[PDB]
RNA sequence: UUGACCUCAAAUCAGGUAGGACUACGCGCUGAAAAUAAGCGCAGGAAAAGAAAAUAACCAUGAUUCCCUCAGUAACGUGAAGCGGGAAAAGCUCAAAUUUGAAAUCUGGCAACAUUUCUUUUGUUGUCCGAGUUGUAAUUUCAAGAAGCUGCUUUGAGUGUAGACGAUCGGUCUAAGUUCCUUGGAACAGGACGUCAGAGAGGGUGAGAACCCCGUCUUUGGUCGAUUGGAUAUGCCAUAUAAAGCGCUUUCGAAGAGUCGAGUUGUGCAGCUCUAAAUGGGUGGUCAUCUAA
RNA sequence: AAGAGCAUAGCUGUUGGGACCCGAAAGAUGGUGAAACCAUCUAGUAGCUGGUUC
């Protein structure tokens, strides 16, 4: 009706036909590979979550439930596996630190972490006692 | 259950610095026309005339009250 | 009785929102669609005998429950810096709401950053 | 005699940006015989609002928006709001505190080196000039927090490769009568005999065509692409002399002014006259609640 | 004083929306000409006139 839409009604240029509509636009799953294998491309998301043993929501369902009649283990072992592979949170000492703590321990014994902190010459960086122990245990 | 203080309710108490900064500006800036007139009336002891003048200027009694003791202490320090 | 609002898009708004739910969780599968909300008492005399979902767990609820503010929003536990526990009843009802949550939670490990040296 | 700056210019100076259109919905402002129409200004795929200077009077609630309810109630024919049920959910950033054992920051020129929806896009590295101490970074935002002490737990604004997985653009593949008899210019009609069907939607063809043709179903998919989203595996670099959470405190805790507000005037806001404070100030019912500019 | 309603659909009545159909003299906004004109408000206003279908 509008001149604009009358233009391409009386024009000869073909439209920009864009083919988009899909009945039941159930979006397919990406993200986790485990769930993506064991998804049901037909059933609904709240069915699929309850099928797998995953709580769809922790909070109460604000409507009805589905009553038709009168993976979680895999996710668990995969989880503890990766925590095991990436577990060694311990860090070594760089060459500077290797000398830095050695010179402090070669002169203030080994357990007087309050004395090393008070030192003004060797403990130039003014590291507190809590970090001095951290560098100590990091050496071993 | 008693509840630990929410740090918003701390607002407006005072500071040792913010008080100090406010004291310096009071001396440095000087005094407004009305504060000059009010101060002179205290020195002449026409306080009842002085206090009623302040309420006309500011608008409320507590505001008028509060400014009077600010100026009187200034008088004694001077 | 001028301009009217007519609801012929009510059935299509029902599906538009259903597809948005479908689109959302499909992006974040293993995790639930929604966060956990606390259980709070309505603020009236007509409604103080009922329990309803809150906005999030106060600072003290998470502190006793064992999560700090920063790691509580990552794993999906909203915080409510406004709300506060005036009585031990609400503290215990919501502390043990997070207790069952942290028991049913499987926090997957992330990728670490390991510099070549210390 | 020579120079710092401060302010102000000029240039077809180097590089940039603004205007006009559309206006269904957005935000203003102005405004009739309804805060309407018309007028005026301004935006985006949404806009606006928005992390309480908020309600309430409870066993308290907890940004905003929207729907239902509250409710034609309350207040004064106009016409609420809180609570209640839902949809959606996500939080945050500055100013005000000395980096003072180091302006740690950034624009630009050139020089290189990569990257690309892309020779069109986007940066990094070095280097010189400047910006900037009348304050650019790090830190902090009241929910706090900083500075110490403590001892536990954590860490990439990287870059290739590979595969799976979604997203888009285009190309590509699809079952079975056109067999006889009468009507007719025409068999797509009538009858006979058969077939296909995950396809008997629709259209075309010389009259009612599942089986002539295009399609339809398969397709919630095969196939060749072309770009890409986010994860996963693995390789190579990595400033970690660091940065962050939480116990503890014999330490401290900065918080927005011709604005709040009082008098009057125009229809909460605005104009004029005057002009604040620091447990202060605002809003509710001495307590509660919030912490504006 | 041993509760009778709640919802829906239909019929009819009535009140309000353009309100059974058509029709009056003004006005308001914003414009175009040189008070007039133009498109809006606007289906302005009816106590009244005319019509109202087997």
Swiss-Prot record, chain A:
Please cite one Gene Ontology biological process associated with this protein.
ribosomal large subunit biogenesis
Functional note = Involved in the biogenesis of the 60S ribosomal subunit.
UniProt keyword Coiled coil, yes or no: no
**Assembly description:** Component of the pre-66S ribosomal particle.
- The name of this protein is Nucleolar protein 16
Q: Where in the cell is it found?
A: Nucleus, Nucleolus
- Residue span of region Disordered: 1-23
Task: Give the record's keywords alphabetically.
Answer: Nucleus, Ribonucleoprotein, Ribosome biogenesis, rRNA processing
Q: Which family does it belong to?
A: Belongs to the NOP16 family.
Assigned GO CC terms = nucleolus; nucleus; preribosome; preribosome, large subunit precursor
Q: Name one Pfam family in it.
A: Nop16
Q: Kindly list the organism's lineage.
A: Eukaryota, Fungi, Dikarya, Ascomycota, Taphrinomycotina
Swiss-Prot record, chain B:
Q: Name one GO biological process term.
A: cytoplasmic translation
Give the organism, scientific name.
Schizosaccharomyces pombe (strain 972 / ATCC 24843) (Fission yeast)
State the protein's name.
Large ribosomal subunit protein eL36B
Statement: the UniProt record of this protein carries the keyword Ribosomal protein: yes
Naming one, the record's GO cellular component terms include:
cytosol
Full-sequence portion shown in this chain: 18 to 95 of 99
Record carries keyword Ribosomal protein? yes
Function (record text): Component of the ribosome, a large ribonucleoprotein complex responsible for the synthesis of proteins in the cell. The small ribosomal subunit (SSU) binds messenger RNAs (mRNAs) and translates the encoded message by selecting cognate aminoacyl-transfer RNA (tRNA) molecules. The large subunit (LSU) contains the ribosomal catalytic site termed the peptidyl transferase center (PTC), which catalyzes the formation of peptide bonds, thereby polymerizing the amino acids delivered by tRNAs into a polypeptide chain.
- Coiled-coil portions: none
More info: There are 2 genes for eL36 in S.pombe.
The entry sums up its family as follows: Belongs to the eukaryotic ribosomal protein eL36 family.
Q: Where in the cell is it found?
A: Cytoplasm
Assembly, in brief, is: Component of the large ribosomal subunit (LSU). Mature yeast ribosomes consist of a small (40S) and a large (60S) subunit. The 40S small subunit contains 1 molecule of ribosomal RNA (18S rRNA) and at least 33 different proteins. The large 60S subunit contains 3 rRNA molecules (25S, 5.8S and 5S rRNA) and at least 46 different proteins.
GO molecular function per UniProt: structural constituent of ribosome
Q: Which UniProt keywords apply?
A: Cytoplasm, Ribonucleoprotein, Ribosomal protein
Its main localization is cytoplasm
Curated annotation (Swiss-Prot), chain C:
**Compartment(s) of residence:** Cytoplasm
Under Gene Ontology molecular function, one entry of this record is: RNA binding
The alphabetized list of GO BP terms reads: cytoplasmic translation
Q: Name one GO cellular component term.
A: cytosol
Keyword check for Translocase: no
Q: Which domain of life is it from?
A: Eukaryota
Main site of residence? cytoplasm
UniProt entry tagged with the keyword ATP-binding: no
Report keywords, A-Z.
Cytoplasm, Phosphoprotein, Ribonucleoprotein, Ribosomal protein
Name the job this protein performs. Component of the ribosome, a large ribonucleoprotein complex responsible for the synthesis of proteins in the cell. The small ribosomal subunit (SSU) binds messenger RNAs (mRNAs) and translates the encoded message by selecting cognate aminoacyl-transfer RNA (tRNA) molecules. The large subunit (LSU) contains the ribosomal catalytic site termed the peptidyl transferase center (PTC), which catalyzes the formation of peptide bonds, thereby polymerizing the amino acids delivered by tRNAs into a polypeptide chain.
Family in the record: Belongs to the eukaryotic ribosomal protein eL13 family.
* Quaternary structure, from the entry: Component of the large ribosomal subunit (LSU). Mature yeast ribosomes consist of a small (40S) and a large (60S) subunit. The 40S small subunit contains 1 molecule of ribosomal RNA (18S rRNA) and at least 33 different proteins. The large 60S subunit contains 3 rRNA molecules (25S, 5.8S and 5S rRNA) and at least 46 different proteins.
Name of the protein: Large ribosomal subunit protein eL13
The scientific name of the source species is Schizosaccharomyces pombe (strain 972 / ATCC 24843)
- Location of this fragment in the whole protein: 19 to 136 of 208
């Amino acid at each position: 009706a509008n001149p604009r839409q009358r233009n391409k009604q009386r024009s000869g240029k073909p439209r920009l036909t864009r083919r988009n509509a899909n009945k039941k636009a159930k979006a397919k799953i990406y993200g986790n590979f485990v769930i993506q294998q064991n998804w049901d491309k037909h059933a609904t998301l709240r069915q699929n979550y309850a099928r797998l043993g995953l709580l769809a929501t922790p909070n109460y369902v604000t409507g009805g439930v589905e009553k038709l009649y009168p993976v979680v283990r895999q996710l668990e072992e995969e989880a503890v596996k990766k925590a095991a592979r990436q577990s060694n949170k311990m860090l070594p000492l760089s060459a500077f630190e290797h000398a830095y703590i050695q010179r402090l321990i070669n002169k203030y014994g080994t357990e007087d972490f309050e004395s090393m902190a008070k030192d003004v010459k060797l403990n130039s960086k003014l590291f507190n006692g809590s970090k001095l122990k951290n560098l100590y245990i990091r050496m071993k | 259950r008693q509840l630990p203080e929410r740090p918003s309710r701390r607002k407006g108490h005072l500071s040792k610095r913010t008080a100090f900064v406010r004291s310096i500006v009071r001396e440095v800036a000087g005094f407004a026309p009305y504060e000059r007139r009010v101060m002179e009336l205290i020195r002449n002891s026409q306080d009842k005339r002085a206090r009623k003048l302040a309420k006309k200027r500011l608008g409320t009694l507590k505001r008028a009250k509060g400014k009077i003791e600010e100026l009187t202490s200034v008088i004694q320090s001077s | 009785q001028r301009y009217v609002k007519t609801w012929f898009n009510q059935p299509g708004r029902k599906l538009r929102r259903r597809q948005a739910r479908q689109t959302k969780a499909a992006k974040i599968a293993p995790r639930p669609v929604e966060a956990i909300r606390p259980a709070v008492k309505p603020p009236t005399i007509r409604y103080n005998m009922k329990v309803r979902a809150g906005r999030g767990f106060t600072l003290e609820e998470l502190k006793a429950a064992g999560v700090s503010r920063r790691v509580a929003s990552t794993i999906g536990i909203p915080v409510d810096h406004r709300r506060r526990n005036r009585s031990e009843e609400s503290l215990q009802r919501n502390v043990e709401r997070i207790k069952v949550y942290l028991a049913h939670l499987i926090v997957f490990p992330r990728k670490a950053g390991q510099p070549k040296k210390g």
